[PDB]
């Protein structure tokens, strides 16, 4: 944890807290200079609370003195912490101007607002003056730079505590906080810079929750040895589709192939299985004879036989949710001694007892609506709830990939956040591609957690490479972009 990293750095390593506070403020100044160019033309309004976030603000304000056109600090707190007091005292000795009353029109005479009111010490809702001032800053159209986290964002959840500052730039210290990563906070954060302010690198690295980065995904990508054959790159079985949902299998299957899997087999009710090969004849699409266009227990043995020859099985996209599908999915997963990727309708009928009793690994890929149904809570209680995700992964021995604009991937010990992608992925078909990608990377030798990490990243990055407006992106275009995403990764 990061506030415990500050403490250790001060208390055990012996770095004066004033030194850390200085480094924080100057980082803010350099970050603004990098974003705004020469600062000397700009007039700055620094809004400072009475805590250490405000102390960081006093450092910023003092270091702009005599270099920029004008600086004014509006001090909004009651008491000052010792480091804030020290730095307030420096600002004044340096000739700085402070006021304690905020006049609505004061924004008119400034170009940049530095928001140092509340950082990680925010507790409860912002009300009264603090709130009226945040609302005025938000209506003002000025350039806003938030110190640490925008004021009003809960740094552990990304939730807005009644009201919050919308920043163009946020400079944070040590590591990104969860509140910069999850929405709405990610939105309010604007452009995020992470500054090194002198914490020991060992401590910064012992942080157990990470953003998935290009470097991390590059080093997880499996090797392609030249002397290889299709079996080197594994075999996937996808169990999917129904008479109602004939497209899902094709998108999942090509997801596996486009990430480099050697062989992909679909098991799909006849005659919907022919849809896949008419579009992509590289796929093997096995006809399953069903009574009414859905998988049922009558197909259990055929699907277990098809599983013997593969490395991983993906199940769920387009299966339909009725009782015969439920019987089949749960009896299948109960007997399949292969890694399983469980998506969509296989999640909706899943009995979680089945996951506990399985020797083999599983990845579950729900959206919040599916996760809500699965644990019997509301969407609002599960959305971006990474602790619930961790608990669930740990209890059921699986990897959980909880999909949203920020996707959470956890196995219970390690939790990762993905921030690639755009709103083009908020469209049917896009989850089916991801399920294939995951199965594909598992087939190639990646562990389930590694497979999930690499896939969520590349799936989002592929979407960003679409040439036209993102809202026109479809799952087929996304498939086409996957090999470009992989190439750009290296």
């Amino acid at each position: 944890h990061m506030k415990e990293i500050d403490e250790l750095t001060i208390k055990e390593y012996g770095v004066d807290s004033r030194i850390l506070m200085e480094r924080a403020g100057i980082s803010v100044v350099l970050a603004m200079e990098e974003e705004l160019g020469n600062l000397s033309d700009y007039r700055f309004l620094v809004l400072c609370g009475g805590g250490n976030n405000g102390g960081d603000g006093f450092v910023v304000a003092r270091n702009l003195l005599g270099v920029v056109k004008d600086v004014l600090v509006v001090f909004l707190g009651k008491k000052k912490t010792p480091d804030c007091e020290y730095n307030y005292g420096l600002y004044k000795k340096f000739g700085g101007k402070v006021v304690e009353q905020f006049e609505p029109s004061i924004l008119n005479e400034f170009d940049v607002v530095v928001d140092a009111i509340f950082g990680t010490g925010l507790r409860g809702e912002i009300t009264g003056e603090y709130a009226e001032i945040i609302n005025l800053v938000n209506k003002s159209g000025k350039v806003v730079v938030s110190v640490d986290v925008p004021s009003g964002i809960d740094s552990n959840t990304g939730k807005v505590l009644r009201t919050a500052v919308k920043a163009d730039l946020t400079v944070t210290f040590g590591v990104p906080k969860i509140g910069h990563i999850l929405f709405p906070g990610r939105d309010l954060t604007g452009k995020l810079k992470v500054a090194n302010i002198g914490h020991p690198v060992h401590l910064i690295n012992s942080i157990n929750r990470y953003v998935i980065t290009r470097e991390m995904v590059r080093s997880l990508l499996p090797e392609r040895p030249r002397d290889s054959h299709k079996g080197t790159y594994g075999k996937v079985l996808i169990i999917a589709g129904s008479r109602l949902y004939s497209g899902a299998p094709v998108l999942s299957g090509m997801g596996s192939l486009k990430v480099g899997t050697g062989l992909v087999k679909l098991a799909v009710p006849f005659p919907q299985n022919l849809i896949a090969t008419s579009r992509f004849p590289e796929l093997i699409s096995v006809p399953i004879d069903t009574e009414k266009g859905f998988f049922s227990l009558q197909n259990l043995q055929e699907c277990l036989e098809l599983s013997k020859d593969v490395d991983v099985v993906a199940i769920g996209p387009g299966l339909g949710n009725n009782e015969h599908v439920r019987e089949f999915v749960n009896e299948f997963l109960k007997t399949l001694e292969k890694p399983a990727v469980i998506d969509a309708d296989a999640i909706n009928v899943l009995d979680t007892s089945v996951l506990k009793e399985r020797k083999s690994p599983a990845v579950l890929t729900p959206h919040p609506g599916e996760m809500a149904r699965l644990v019997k809570k509301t969407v609002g209680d599960v959305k971006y709830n990474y602790e619930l995700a961790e608990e669930f992964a740990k209890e059921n021995d699986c990897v959980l990939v909880l999909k949203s604009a920020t996707t959470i991937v956890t196995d219970g010990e390690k939790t990762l956040f993905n921030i690639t992608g755009n709103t083009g992925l908020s469209k049917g078909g896009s989850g089916d591609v991801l399920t294939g990608m995951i199965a594909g990377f598992i087939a190639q030798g990646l562990s389930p957690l590694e497979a999930s990490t690499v896939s969520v990243y590349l799936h989002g990055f592929a979407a960003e490479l679409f040439e036209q407006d993102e809202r026109g992106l479809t799952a087929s275009e996304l498939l086409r972009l996957i090999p470009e995403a992989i190439r750009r990764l290296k």
């Binding site: 810079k193 992470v194 500054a195 090194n196």
Partner: peptide, 7 residues
Amino acid sequence: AAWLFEA
């Protein structure tokens, strides 16, 4: 060029 900042 990354001693101070990560993007």
